[PDB]
Amino acid sequence: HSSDEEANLFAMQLASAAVLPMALKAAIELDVLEIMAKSVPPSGYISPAEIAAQLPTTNPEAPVMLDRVLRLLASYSVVTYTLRELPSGKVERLYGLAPVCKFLTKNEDGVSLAPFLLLATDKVLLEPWFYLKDAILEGGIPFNKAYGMNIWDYFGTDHRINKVFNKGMSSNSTITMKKILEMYNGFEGLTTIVDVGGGTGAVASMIVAKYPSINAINFDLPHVIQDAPAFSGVEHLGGDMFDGVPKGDAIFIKWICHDWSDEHCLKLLKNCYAALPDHGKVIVAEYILPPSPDPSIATKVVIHTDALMLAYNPGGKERTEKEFQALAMASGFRGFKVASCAFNTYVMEFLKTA
Amino acid sequence: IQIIPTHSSDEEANLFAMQLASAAVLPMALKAAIELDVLEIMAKSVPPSGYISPAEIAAQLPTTNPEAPVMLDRVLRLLASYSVVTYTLRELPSGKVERLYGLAPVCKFLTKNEDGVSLAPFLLLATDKVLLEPWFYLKDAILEGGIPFNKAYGMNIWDYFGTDHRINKVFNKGMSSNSTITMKKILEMYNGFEGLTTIVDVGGGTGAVASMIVAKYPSINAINFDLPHVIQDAPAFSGVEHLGGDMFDGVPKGDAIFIKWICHDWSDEHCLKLLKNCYAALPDHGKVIVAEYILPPSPDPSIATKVVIHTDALMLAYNPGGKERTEKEFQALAMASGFRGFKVASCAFNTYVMEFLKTA
Ligand SMILES: Nc1ncnc2c1ncn2[C@@H]1O[C@H](CSCC[C@H](N)C(=O)O)[C@@H](O)[C@H]1O
Ligand SMILES: Nc1ncnc2c1ncn2[C@@H]1O[C@H](CSCC[C@H](N)C(=O)O)[C@@H](O)[C@H]1O
Ligand SMILES: COc1cc(/C=C/CO)cc(OC)c1O
Ligand SMILES: COc1cc(/C=C/CO)cc(OC)c1O
């Protein structure tokens, strides 16, 4: 029918679906979205030739090649567009920023999700996808099949991707934690907080900024900590969390549990229980898997991240709120609180006492 | 109506940026599903309910990996979120809920039909490592000029396919399966091949289209013309004469020349050179039959438009000046190469069939 026509066209759209994130990657790497944000008012539009005039190029085709990339981004509403008729009767397009561009260009604090997109579309993280069929048939982890070691060991050998990853995570966490800290009061009154797997320390620096008397420890692998900027109030410390974690009044773990199997999460969580005082807690910041494969963007983000963990991590996966309760119970915690949520990230507390 | 920025609108904007960041997971997970034969296993193995569990799928894979079922479930859950497959939920003994899966309407074109073809080989082409590589050179092409594919490989795509036998095969089969489906539909509706003595398919690939034309019109002389490395492989279809060459030098003579998905591979200058060659290869009453997408008036959100604009982005990555064109632009190419008549004759699956008529 028109029915068969629609099914065929959707199949073609799926086949070429990687054109969208790769076009967007090129637009971000060329600084297009920043040039648009600084060159016209928030509600205005700019031509591809005026954008290209701010790139360091003499390529006569740069305007049309940008138009082609921007038209693909416009079709998905990543940028806005308006049409302007030409004397020939042909029409050209001028482009503006759509609401998603607020998160793809630097905000008042100089952060966005653009480094996160540059991480997600890096050649290094695309390669494991070619080994997913093998891992399903033969066992194993697609990343390890591509690289011969686990991802964190690999990042300790490839300095470029270590920095790309750490910056991707730091920028994404800055945006999420800025929102959580406006709503969540669970750090108030702590003497010491430990960010286990804290990366380059962005979250711990924001906690100490909000609560200047808190003593904060940012704990991660030593190839990450070596790149961590100094921040007043934060002590950076290298190590392996599965051997033990630093003591504190609370331990914060953001996007750690979803990297690991249930068994490895229990080992880590018991190390955290051992590190806390009797009345201490673990503050767990993670997505929560929805109950069905619904088409919403928020659910797609979680299920995309579940698929990433499948490709990258040994046993990592997304979990439901009950599955998080089960991890807390089996590692000895007695209370469980869903305390706040921001950009899909829920903040749960695993309380040693209830 | 103006949407006033709020917490709620900022959540949706943030999440769409995260979805974009990881959007390649969808075609790469669908690639793995197809390579594992999961959609074919589902099509052939429905219980009479029409829904199958990941364990039941896994049981049919050449595997003894006991994590295969849960791995499949996770892949299928991403596919189901995008309506590539369907699901149903069933409550387990422990009170946990399991998913069972079914084929969604798109799967009619991702599994073999009655003629044994689908768009599955096209998806394997589009997601092949070789064709993902040029995307890392897109920013370079914009800043330096040139072609992302040539920056990755040090030669043009056709030259590269002549050096890499595995990808040449993957490409020729992706195109022949796709073109078989579209051509079957065009041949039901379009009458322009009737009464021709000789048809030349220029850039015909392995010749699937020429073989369809002669099957329908057994009195026609059919020539399949392409590069020697494509022709070498090509099935010896009854009634098709294969000829290797380079179309920019010239093309075989015929009453009509058919070019499907050729113009969109090449710059305007290249197209003018090709279409002048065609003009010279035709009798006075001859025509070029051109099967291509047509760019819509605006970058609207429809799937049909998106397909054309995805293909425009594929041509930017792969091809020497290739791009999608509007009907007015195809008309301008026809006039600029000497043709006096132009008509849009038919359309199937977004592919329009245009005729460039030597005499109007
Ligand atoms: N065995 C281990 N000990 C300590 N940290 C580890 C680890 N294995 C992995 N990690 C760290 O776990 C972090 C996971 S990514 C999450 C980073 C940060 N919490 C955020 O949300 O931005 C990485 O920084 C990684 O280096
Ligand atoms: N210079 C040239 N002369 C002849 N054919 C060429 C050519 N350069 C590229 N091609 C061919 O152009 C075809 C483009 S792909 C489209 C193939 C076929 N018409 C279909 O629609 O299925 C390929 O088969 C390629 O080898
Ligand atoms: C492997 O560690 C992670 C990798 C990735 C992979 C990012 C590439 O899209 C994402 C994460 O949070 C979503 C992680 O904790
Ligand atoms: C190199 O020429 C083509 C490449 C491609 C690339 C297919 C991979 O998505 C598609 C075509 O028709 C759509 C072409 O004529």
Coordinates of C-alpha atoms in Angstrom, one line a residue, chain B residues 138-301:
Chain B
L138 CA 33.7 15.2 7.0
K139 CA 35.0 18.3 8.8
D140 CA 38.2 17.9 6.7
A141 CA 36.3 18.0 3.5
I142 CA 34.4 21.1 4.4
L143 CA 37.6 23.0 5.5
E144 CA 39.9 21.7 2.8
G145 CA 37.6 20.9 -0.1
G146 CA 37.5 17.4 -1.5
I147 CA 35.7 14.2 -0.6
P148 CA 35.6 12.5 2.9
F149 CA 35.9 9.1 1.3
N150 CA 39.0 10.0 -0.7
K151 CA 40.6 11.6 2.4
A152 CA 40.1 8.2 4.3
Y153 CA 41.2 5.9 1.5
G154 CA 43.5 8.0 -0.9
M155 CA 41.3 7.3 -3.9
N156 CA 37.7 7.6 -5.0
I157 CA 35.1 5.1 -4.0
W158 CA 34.9 3.2 -7.2
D159 CA 38.7 2.8 -7.4
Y160 CA 38.7 1.6 -3.8
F161 CA 35.9 -1.0 -4.5
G162 CA 38.1 -2.3 -7.3
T163 CA 40.8 -3.0 -4.7
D164 CA 38.6 -4.5 -1.9
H165 CA 36.7 -7.6 -3.1
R166 CA 34.7 -8.0 0.1
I167 CA 33.2 -4.5 0.1
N168 CA 32.7 -4.5 -3.7
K169 CA 30.5 -7.6 -3.2
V170 CA 28.7 -6.0 -0.2
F171 CA 28.0 -2.9 -2.3
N172 CA 26.9 -4.5 -5.5
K173 CA 24.5 -6.8 -3.5
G174 CA 23.1 -3.9 -1.4
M175 CA 22.4 -2.0 -4.6
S176 CA 21.0 -5.0 -6.5
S177 CA 18.6 -6.0 -3.7
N178 CA 17.4 -2.5 -3.2
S179 CA 17.0 -1.9 -6.9
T180 CA 15.2 -5.2 -7.4
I181 CA 12.5 -4.1 -5.0
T182 CA 12.1 -0.6 -6.4
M183 CA 12.3 -1.8 -10.1
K184 CA 9.6 -4.5 -9.6
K185 CA 7.3 -1.7 -8.6
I186 CA 8.3 0.7 -11.3
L187 CA 7.8 -2.0 -13.9
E188 CA 4.2 -2.5 -12.8
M189 CA 3.4 1.2 -13.4
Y190 CA 5.7 2.7 -15.8
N191 CA 5.3 2.0 -19.6
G192 CA 8.3 3.9 -21.0
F193 CA 10.2 0.7 -22.0
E194 CA 7.5 -0.5 -24.4
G195 CA 8.3 -0.5 -28.0
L196 CA 12.1 0.1 -27.5
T197 CA 14.4 -2.0 -29.6
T198 CA 17.5 -1.6 -27.4
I199 CA 17.9 -0.3 -23.8
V200 CA 21.2 0.5 -22.2
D201 CA 21.4 0.5 -18.3
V202 CA 24.4 2.9 -17.7
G203 CA 26.0 2.2 -14.3
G204 CA 23.8 -0.9 -14.2
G205 CA 25.8 -2.6 -11.5
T206 CA 25.6 -6.4 -11.7
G207 CA 22.7 -6.1 -14.1
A208 CA 19.7 -6.9 -11.9
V209 CA 17.7 -4.1 -13.5
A210 CA 18.6 -4.9 -17.1
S211 CA 17.6 -8.6 -16.4
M212 CA 14.2 -7.4 -15.1
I213 CA 13.6 -5.3 -18.2
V214 CA 14.3 -8.2 -20.6
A215 CA 12.2 -10.6 -18.5
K216 CA 9.3 -8.3 -19.0
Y217 CA 10.1 -7.4 -22.6
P218 CA 11.8 -10.5 -24.2
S219 CA 12.0 -8.7 -27.6
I220 CA 14.3 -6.0 -26.3
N221 CA 18.1 -6.0 -26.7
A222 CA 19.5 -5.1 -23.2
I223 CA 22.9 -3.8 -22.5
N224 CA 24.3 -3.6 -18.9
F225 CA 27.1 -1.1 -18.8
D226 CA 29.4 -0.5 -15.9
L227 CA 33.1 -0.5 -14.7
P228 CA 35.1 -3.8 -15.5
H229 CA 35.4 -4.7 -11.8
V230 CA 31.6 -4.7 -11.4
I231 CA 30.9 -6.5 -14.7
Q232 CA 33.5 -9.3 -14.1
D233 CA 31.3 -10.6 -11.1
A234 CA 27.9 -10.1 -12.8
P235 CA 25.5 -13.1 -13.3
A236 CA 25.2 -14.1 -17.0
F237 CA 21.5 -13.1 -17.2
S238 CA 19.6 -14.4 -20.2
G239 CA 19.2 -11.5 -22.8
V240 CA 21.6 -9.1 -21.2
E241 CA 24.9 -8.1 -22.8
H242 CA 27.4 -6.9 -20.2
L243 CA 29.9 -4.3 -21.3
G244 CA 32.7 -2.7 -19.2
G245 CA 33.7 0.9 -19.7
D246 CA 33.8 4.3 -18.2
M247 CA 30.6 6.4 -19.0
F248 CA 32.4 9.7 -19.0
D249 CA 34.3 8.5 -22.1
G250 CA 31.1 7.5 -23.8
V251 CA 28.2 5.0 -23.5
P252 CA 26.7 2.2 -25.7
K253 CA 24.2 3.1 -28.3
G254 CA 20.5 2.3 -27.7
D255 CA 16.9 3.6 -28.2
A256 CA 16.9 4.7 -24.6
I257 CA 19.4 4.9 -21.8
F258 CA 18.4 4.2 -18.2
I259 CA 20.4 5.7 -15.3
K260 CA 19.3 4.8 -11.8
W261 CA 21.1 6.5 -8.9
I262 CA 23.9 7.7 -11.3
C263 CA 23.3 11.4 -11.4
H264 CA 23.2 11.6 -7.6
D265 CA 26.8 10.2 -7.4
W266 CA 28.3 13.1 -9.4
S267 CA 28.7 16.9 -9.6
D268 CA 26.7 19.0 -12.0
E269 CA 29.7 19.2 -14.4
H270 CA 30.1 15.4 -14.3
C271 CA 26.4 15.0 -15.0
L272 CA 26.5 17.4 -17.9
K273 CA 29.4 15.4 -19.4
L274 CA 27.5 12.1 -18.9
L275 CA 24.2 13.4 -20.3
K276 CA 25.9 14.9 -23.4
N277 CA 27.4 11.4 -23.9
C278 CA 23.9 9.9 -23.6
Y279 CA 22.5 12.5 -26.0
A280 CA 25.2 11.4 -28.6
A281 CA 24.4 7.7 -28.1
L282 CA 20.6 8.1 -28.8
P283 CA 18.7 8.3 -32.1
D284 CA 16.8 11.5 -32.8
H285 CA 13.7 10.3 -31.0
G286 CA 15.5 8.7 -28.1
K287 CA 15.4 9.5 -24.4
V288 CA 17.3 9.1 -21.1
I289 CA 15.1 7.5 -18.4
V290 CA 16.6 8.8 -15.0
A291 CA 15.5 7.1 -11.7
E292 CA 16.4 9.3 -8.7
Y293 CA 15.0 10.8 -5.6
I294 CA 13.8 14.4 -5.9
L295 CA 14.5 16.9 -3.1
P296 CA 11.4 18.2 -1.4
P297 CA 10.8 22.0 -1.0
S298 CA 11.9 22.2 2.6
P299 CA 13.6 20.1 5.3
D300 CA 10.4 18.9 6.7
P301 CA 10.3 16.1 9.4

